[PDB]
Design a protein around this nucleic acid. Sequence first.
RNA 1: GGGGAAACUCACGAGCGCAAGACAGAGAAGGGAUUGACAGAUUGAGAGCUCUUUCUUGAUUCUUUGGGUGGUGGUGCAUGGCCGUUCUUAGUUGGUGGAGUGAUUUGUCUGGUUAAUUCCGUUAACGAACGAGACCUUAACCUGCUAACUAGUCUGCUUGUAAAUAACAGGUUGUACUUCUUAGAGGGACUAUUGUGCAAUAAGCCAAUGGAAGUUUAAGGCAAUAACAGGUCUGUGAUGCCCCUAGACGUGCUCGGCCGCACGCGCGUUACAAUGACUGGCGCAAAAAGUAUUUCCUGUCCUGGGAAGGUACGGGUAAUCUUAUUAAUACCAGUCGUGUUAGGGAUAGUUCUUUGGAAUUGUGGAUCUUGAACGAGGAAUUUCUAGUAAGUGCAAGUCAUCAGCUUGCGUUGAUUAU
Lengths: 228, 143, 64, 108
Amino acid sequence: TTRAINKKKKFVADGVFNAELHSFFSKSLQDAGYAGIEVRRTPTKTEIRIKATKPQQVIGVEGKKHKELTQFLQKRFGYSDDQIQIWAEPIKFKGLCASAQVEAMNYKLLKDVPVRLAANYIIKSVIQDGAKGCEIIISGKLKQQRAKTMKFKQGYMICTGQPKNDYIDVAVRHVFFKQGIMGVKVKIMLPYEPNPAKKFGVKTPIPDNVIIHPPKQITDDKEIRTAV
Amino acid sequence: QQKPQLVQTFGRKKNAVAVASVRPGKGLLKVNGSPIDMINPQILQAKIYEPILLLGQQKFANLDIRIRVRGSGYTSQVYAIRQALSKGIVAYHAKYVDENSKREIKEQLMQYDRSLLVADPRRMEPKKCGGRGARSKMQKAYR
Amino acid sequence: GRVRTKTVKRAAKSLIEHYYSKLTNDFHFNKKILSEVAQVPSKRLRNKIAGFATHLMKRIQKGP
Amino acid sequence: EVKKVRVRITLTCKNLKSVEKATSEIVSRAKKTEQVEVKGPVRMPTKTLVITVRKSPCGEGSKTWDRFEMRIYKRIIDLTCNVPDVKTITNFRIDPGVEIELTMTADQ
RNA sequence: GGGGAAACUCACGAGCGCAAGACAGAGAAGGGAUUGACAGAUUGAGAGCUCUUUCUUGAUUCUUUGGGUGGUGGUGCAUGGCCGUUCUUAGUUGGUGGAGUGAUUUGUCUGGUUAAUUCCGUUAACGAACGAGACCUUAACCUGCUAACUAGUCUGCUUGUAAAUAACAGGUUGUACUUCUUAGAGGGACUAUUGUGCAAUAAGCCAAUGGAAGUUUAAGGCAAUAACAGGUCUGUGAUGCCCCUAGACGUGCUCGGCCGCACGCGCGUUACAAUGACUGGCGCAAAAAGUAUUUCCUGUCCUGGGAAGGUACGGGUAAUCUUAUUAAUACCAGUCGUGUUAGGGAUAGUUCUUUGGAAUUGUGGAUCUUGAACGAGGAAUUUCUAGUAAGUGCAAGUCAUCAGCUUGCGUUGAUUAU
Ligand SMILES: [Mg+2]
Ligand SMILES: [Mg+2]
Ligand SMILES: [Mg+2]
Ligand SMILES: [Mg+2]
Ligand SMILES: [Mg+2]
Ligand SMILES: [Mg+2]
Ligand SMILES: [Mg+2]
Ligand SMILES: [Mg+2]
Ligand SMILES: [Mg+2]
Ligand SMILES: [Mg+2]
Ligand SMILES: [Mg+2]
Ligand SMILES: [Mg+2]
Ligand SMILES: [Mg+2]
Ligand SMILES: [Mg+2]
Ligand SMILES: [Mg+2]
Ligand SMILES: [Mg+2]
Ligand SMILES: [Mg+2]
């Protein structure tokens, strides 16, 4: 053992570790769509899976960003080279990831592409990938020196209830302009996926859906005493 | 292991719990290892004597009953003892006597009071922020 | 406050609609029937639906 | 060379589902092997860390509070075994948030 | 504004120190850029701050000319993010049909019904989306299930006091057990049953009975459309623009200040006593916390009249130890006897202790004194329907020390309306 630590104080410390990682990766990884991080912890090792849209930029040109990252975690915490492992995992459906899509419109808005068009492009993408519904909020100066707030909805959307925390995926970004910070939220309501067979949506249905299942007519042979 | 002639019932009010154990013999009531006589607020000792007087001593002279009580405060404790004792006799008459007697003592008791065989569902209410209590709130200035 | 909602009444209508021959004046039967017959995400929900559907079985026994 | 060793497995997790997965496949796996005797899942009391935080970053006049919970579930499983059997029963995938601690008391 | 500020915090004030003035161009520097510092003055200060005094040091760069860091400096009417509020009220949309040249309208309603634009029904509307509901967390039911030496019970041994197969207590024990205790699975409630009860017999309401539970079981979490130039540049290495840039609005150090008092206005603690105060006695909680090893909870033990000190023996990163206790109302005795009385204790003066370099402008605590207002409160006005109000203590946040605050936890338990 290393040190005997408070199960409470340890666990909080583990969560704080996780959060520091998430801030670190969202901050230093900003170009390739970065979604999530999953941390397994072995007496031997610490395994970090970076779930991302463009794994290719996580690795870089033959581990330029990979080696950079790995060494960053090394100098930061102190770690043996066998003690740290970084994997990058692809998110198979980019349209179901918010942080990704908000990065997309971050990008498109930097290139001066107009609001409504961009918003539409992403929304159409998101629903093209099978998401039931999506919404985008852009706030701040758009038109003029006086702040505006513009919402774009299409499809199906829930806000309130525990289902919110399940089906709805949200991300925000701060976007920088000569004029100041403008900001952008993306809410993608995910679809309902009944089978563990795929990484998709939500495994548990909206508590509202009630379905009656009408009866069937099938093959019936009886067993009867013969008459001679 | 020789399974004893034991019966064990529990009883409850607020945070208080009473476990009464019933075995046959010359009747004792000892609560926490002491006669009812010494239960702290004197007034409500009659509360414990209630189901005893209701059933008559004749049922109780046949049985030694020992009730250990740990719980919240004096009164709830008294009610827990009450409860455990009451449904304790009932459980005895269930295992070792005919069912009929269990039934008629059940009815006998509950016609007098239902708090004997049924527990008070009430517990404390947690406190809502912005108040000195679980409803009442910080004073407000309108004008 | 015991007024029953859209989801529940649509549900009950459907459950009787397809299943009337299977259904009983007993709540406890009809709730199991429902459970087999349908996807209901909540215990509470299923029970509300079953109760209303039972209620409607009784109302059907009386007439239109 | 017979080894009778009592094995103490303590599982701690912030997620319940994960820990019951772990628990129940340890119990399943241990029972599946003949050298093994299982003192079953022991469920410790559930630890709830609460942090009550004021919502508004300002004094903006209404006081609202956030009840922030973290639950820690702690399980214990006991085994009567030898080393290799232990390493057999620990051989399966586990969800990330799980802490697994092993202790060995020799027994004669 | 976690806004309980002794330093710090900290922005305010008085007096002093550093550069953490990068980077580029020019000149200067190795035959010297610059750093440091005894000692005497000096200073609040062993600040080499300054001055005299030289010895070190060896490009870490100095002078200008540009310019960046940095800024708890301005601007929430430049902004993000978050958060209050309308409001937890029940609201808000669109498609296809109907009506208007049109803005617009129907949908989205006379009427019942619901906590609810909840439903029923009416129906030029038909179907839908958001919000409500659904959901989720906690609390309440299981003598049935799955198990437990980090829970308890019993069984058999023993021990003590006793005439003891009495009683009450310990210590042990087991292919033992689940009532109590954890807490996983699954049950359970659906307003169930009944009702020549009210409902145009429809939604629903009502009552009685059963029930652990029938106020949407209880208490909460979440919170549509739209706003309100609400609050926040002082939470943020989120920022636009503006400002300060070397005796700086940068980063430190020392002492004050935010607690300064004729007064005005808010939260609140404590009281005006007999349903009381005081002196004894009394095996009644819950929920929280807790050591990067002596530092965190702390149990014994010892010293002191006391707050508190030892360090003598120890446990616990905790269902194992502090502890399953140590709370206070309450109860039982006894004093006191309706009077500014022991009610009530503000304010004061000595002593003692503890946290801290630092307690003076009393950090807290202890002992003697000292004992004020207050004899139930003008016009006004707040919150509140059941384990609820109210009283009563306990923890957690803050935190070295400091709760009259907050956030929670139980105990004792109502009057009056559904
Ligand atoms: Mg109080
Ligand atoms: Mg102040
Ligand atoms: Mg700047
Ligand atoms: Mg400053
Ligand atoms: Mg229209
Ligand atoms: Mg039209
Ligand atoms: Mg027309
Ligand atoms: Mg209208
Ligand atoms: Mg409609
Ligand atoms: Mg509710
Ligand atoms: Mg203003
Ligand atoms: Mg001590
Ligand atoms: Mg304590
Ligand atoms: Mg003094
Ligand atoms: Mg004082
Ligand atoms: Mg403390
Ligand atoms: Mg405060």
